[PDB]
């Protein structure tokens, strides 16, 4: 009946951006008023839709993408952006319709010795298409001679880990992202706002 937004935002564990997690929100009354008033969000940028006039807009399906990146990368979670996250981890299309929500999670995703559980993709032969997920760990061949599963000359490992130490500056501290995207088909609307 009531949309399970708690299970997305308040989840105990988030995923790495290279293996970002999608949850399907369907068949429920979507209360967006909390997010509107909530002062716990550092980024609440919506594209194609307004957050205020969201409690009178029905949608056929809503999807929630969640991952963890560092502050200096939250700006890349938007249409028309480039960078390591936008090119190799999570790409939004130019016609994206939805909201990008983010908040600082330094107290949770940082250990004093550095949290290394979160990864991100560093090398790829090509940019990601919109809403593409790459979880392969094949050795990135950057040059002439091939790689045989081992790193070496012009042979890299595609995944890298963040530092995430409590003393880091804001721009290097971990951030939790929730990307709500709305789809509207010529279909009955199961997700309505109220």
């Amino acid at each position, epitope marked *: 009946n009531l949309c399970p937004f708690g299970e997305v935002f308040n989840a105990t564990r988030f995923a790495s951006v290279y293996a970002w997690n999608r949850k399907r929100i369907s068949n429920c009354v979507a209360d967006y008023s909390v997010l509107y008033n909530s002062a716990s969000f550092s980024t609440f940028k919506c594209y194609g839709v307004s957050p205020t006039k969201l409690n009178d807009l029905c949608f056929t399906n809503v999807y929630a993408d969640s991952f963890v990146i560092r502050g200096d990368e939250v700006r890349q979670i938007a249409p028309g952006q480039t*960078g390591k996250i936008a090119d190799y981890n999570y790409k939004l299309p130019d016609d994206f319709t939805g909201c990008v929500i983010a908040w600082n999670s330094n107290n949770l995703d940082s250990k004093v010795g550095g949290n290394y559980n979160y990864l991100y993709r560093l090398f790829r032969k090509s940019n990601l298409k919109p809403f593409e997920r790459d979880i392969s760990t094949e*050795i990135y061949q950057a040059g002439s001679t091939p790689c045989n599963g081992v790193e070496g000359f*012009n*042979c*890299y490992f595609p995944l890298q880990s963040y530092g995430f130490q409590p003393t880091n500056g804001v721009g*290097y501290q971990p951030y939790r992202v929730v990307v709500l995207s709305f789809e509207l088909l010529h279909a009955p609307a199961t997700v309505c706002g109220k």
Partner: antibody
Amino acid sequence: QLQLQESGPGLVKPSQTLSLTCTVSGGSISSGSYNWTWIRQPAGKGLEWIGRIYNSGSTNYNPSLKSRVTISVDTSKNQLSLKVRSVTAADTAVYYCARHCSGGTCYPKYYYGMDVWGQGTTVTVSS
Amino acid sequence: QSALTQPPSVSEAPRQRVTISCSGSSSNIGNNAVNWYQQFPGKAPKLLIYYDDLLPSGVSDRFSGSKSGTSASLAISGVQSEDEADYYCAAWDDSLNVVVFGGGTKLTVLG
């Protein structure tokens, strides 16, 4: 303790060959995924990339200087050398040696970055 | 050569924010990683930012790099007396077949 030690004559005579050395201490020169490059800097001006050496001898030089430069590696002496032939006053600069990482067997894994530099020897080309 | 272009000098007050821009073309910054180096008077350049925006251990997190299109920028939030040096941007140019360095930007803290 990865350190590079540069040695060479401070003064070189025009039209003759300039020769420098860059001896590696605290490790081995033929280890990681590194491009061992040479860079010179005229006093007061900017940096100029001379060339590089990788694998077991292969090299690629700056086209404006490709014919006059030679970059070798003496693994037994654990050093790389620079040869600049037929020098002019325009070759007066502070010459550095550094290591450029291009792979996954670099420690630390500073991809595309010029990791460890030499102190820099000053070459003055004049008779 | 002079493919990468930086302002010759930028100055700001202590505890302010300074941006050192690096303009190039698609053959260097557009399709290749940008490295930043810090050079103090009388010493060799020191790797400051590698692969566009990555920070080595031992460099203050006040520094950060960014890249969009054919231009890169180095940001030093919280300028300090320790930060007065020459900063060069570097990248491999596919046309020249050469590691291109900028002219360098001399940061002078004003206070």
